[PDB]
């Protein structure tokens, strides 16, 4: 690298010393790609190594084998793991890719070209070459459209991915006739983020998910061709600040936004995040409390439709804020729940008490592992459930853990966005290093009073 | 002055005030602990307990906090104070519904 006195930046700002060195930027970036792929491959190897096949696969502290299993790679009808070789081969391919990526990264950091445009005009860039920035965006957006269409190929032509909503308790299903229509996809993206609908955590079916992936892949590919074949407009070039620091701020704000989104995804979804592979979400295990208790006391002999609780609303059933009958526990805040074992028990108008009395199914009944243990409690130091629960079980819900890690780190990335937003705006103005000490804006404008 | 409305204009006053606030706060809280040394506590709001006694419908987060303090006392002093031989059974220890 280089020193402070010539770069102007201290060691704790040294990664900015390579702002104007595109080759070193490439070296650091390819090395980072190696780091990410290396962690992915390593963790997939561990989650293969620490596997107990007879138990349900969420109590072993495994976060990304659910990522492979959501693709249906070795998943039984009810959700049985069956085989671990796809997870193993995924981890090893990631590790080899990590080795080649890391070698390329260290090569471009050390012996790679120090500056790129003198030999490769296709790879060199000053940070005001707005046309070539748009070209780079076009390339990356084409890549993202290719990845989305890859998920399309898996869902429609490779016979994979698990649907939790198949009858009997779900099934790995090759998706036929996905819903790609603009009305449902855009209404899915422009609705409220609260419990009435949920903005982006509202996708109840994988035809809707895959149709959204149709839309995102097509849009990214067409916008990639657009960004390749167009030039920034005067309004964009006036409203935006164009520097490598402002680009960091835009990327940081965006990645914080999708980090917050991914946190909420992990916390609430049971469709794109199967509960059978992740553990229950917030509203479930509490819906499971109410469901197990209702079936148990209607089994003993006590009625539940005429059963009234301590507060006048119902110990086992009440009416929702809307005119539908919902479960009577304290899970009445979670009346908007949709999990694979309630729709066969869901009636149009009400909960269909005669269906509850007679048409109960034993898969629904045996869906009590979500109830008894595994609720999204779990403490910082494992232990059992609530903060008073004692050292009896070793469990924490991966939904909780990769929700809180993601939202915390997304908040820190929001802070980083704020930092580089302000510094980029101030540097493009000209006072990143302070006020000029002789002609301040303060002395040039009027006093307040 | 344009963000918060009022701003510091003398750094002697600024630094004296930032000396003043923690010393003042710690001294007042020290006087509070001096008060608690003789079991003088700000526990009851007599109007609030009288009106909550004559009306079972009125309640506050304060009333919840008082009852919750009774819960802390009852469930903790049993082992917290071993010299008191507090073998209080579970049916005199107070509960909510279902917990």
């Amino acid at each position: 690298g280089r020193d402070q006195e010539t770069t102007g930046f201290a060691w704790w700002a040294g990664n900015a010393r390579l702002i104007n060195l595109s080759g070193k930027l490439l070296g650091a970036h390819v090395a980072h790609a190696g780091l990410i792929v290396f962690w992915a491959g390593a963790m997939n190897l561990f989650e293969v190594s620490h596997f107990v096949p007879e138990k349900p696969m969420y109590e072993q502290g495994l976060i990304l084998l659910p990522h492979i299993a959501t693709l249906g790679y070795g998943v039984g009808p009810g959700g049985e793991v069956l085989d671990t070789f796809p997870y193993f081969v995924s981890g090893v391919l990631h590790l080899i890719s990590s080795a080649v990526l890391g070698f390329g990264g260290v090569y471009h950091s050390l012996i790679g070209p120090e500056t790129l445009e003198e030999s490769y005009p296709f790879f060199g860039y000053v940070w005001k070459d707005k046309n070539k920035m748009t070209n780079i965006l076009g390339y990356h957006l084409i890549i993202l459209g290719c990845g989305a269409w890859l998920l399309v190929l898996k869902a429609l032509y490779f016979g994979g991915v698990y649907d939790t909503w198949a009858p009997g308790g779900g099934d790995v299903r090759i998706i036929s006739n996905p819903t790609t229509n603009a009305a449902i996809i855009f209404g899915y993206i422009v609705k409220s983020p609260f419990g009435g609908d949920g903005w982006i955590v509202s996708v109840d079916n994988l035809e809707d998910i895959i149709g959204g992936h149709i839309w995102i892949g097509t849009l990214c590919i067409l916008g990639g061709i657009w960004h390749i074949y167009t030039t920034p407009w005067p309004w964009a070039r006036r409203a935006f600040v164009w520097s490598g620091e402002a680009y960091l701020s835009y990327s940081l704000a965006a990645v914080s936004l999708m980090g917050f989104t991914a946190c909420c995804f992990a916390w609430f979804n049971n469709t794109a995040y199967p509960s059978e592979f992740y553990g229950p979400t917030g509203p479930e295990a509490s819906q499971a409390q109410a469901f197990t208790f209702l079936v148990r006391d209607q089994r003993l002999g006590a009625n539940v439709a005429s059963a009234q609780g301590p507060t006048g609303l119902g110990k086992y059933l009440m009416r929702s804020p809307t005119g539908e009958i919902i479960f009577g526990g304290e899970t009445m805040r979670f009346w908007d729940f949709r999990g694979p074992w309630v729709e066969p028990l869901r009636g149009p108008s009400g909960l269909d008490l005669v269906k509850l009395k007679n048409d109960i199914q034993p898969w629904q009944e045996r869906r009590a592992a979500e109830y008894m243990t595994h609720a999204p409690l779990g403490s910082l130091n494992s232990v059992g459930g609530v903060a008073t629960e004692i050292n009896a079980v070793n469990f924490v819900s991966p939904r909780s853990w990769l929700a809180t890690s993601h939202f915390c780190l997304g908040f820190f990335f929001f802070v980083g966005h704020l930092w580089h937003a302000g510094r980029a705006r101030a540097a493009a103005a000209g006072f990143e290093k302070g006020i000029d000490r002789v002609d301040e804006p303060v002395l040039s404008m009027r006093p307040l009073d | 002055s344009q963000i918060f409305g009022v701003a510091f204009s003398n750094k002697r006053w600024l630094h004296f005030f930032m000396l003043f606030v923690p010393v003042t706060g710690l001294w007042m809280s020290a006087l509070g602990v001096v008060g608690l040394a003789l079991n003088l506590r700000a526990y009851d709001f007599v109007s609030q307990e009288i009106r909550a006694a004559e009306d079972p419908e009125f309640e506050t987060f304060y009333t919840k906090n008082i009852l919750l303090n009774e819960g802390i006392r009852a469930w903790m002093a049993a082992q917290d104070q071993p010299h008191e031989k507090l073998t209080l059974p579970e049916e005199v220890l107070p509960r909510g519904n279902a917990l």
Partner: peptide
């Protein structure tokens, strides 16, 4: 009489805050 006492002290302190914000002494020495 209880409630108007609290109301008066609260709105009075808010009034002193308002008066100190907009009708303060103009600042001198920096």
């Amino acid at each position: 009489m209880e409630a108007l006492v609290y109301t008066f002290l609260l709105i009075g302190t808010l009034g002193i805050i308002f008066f100190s914000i907009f009708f303060r002494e103009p600042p001198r020495i920096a």
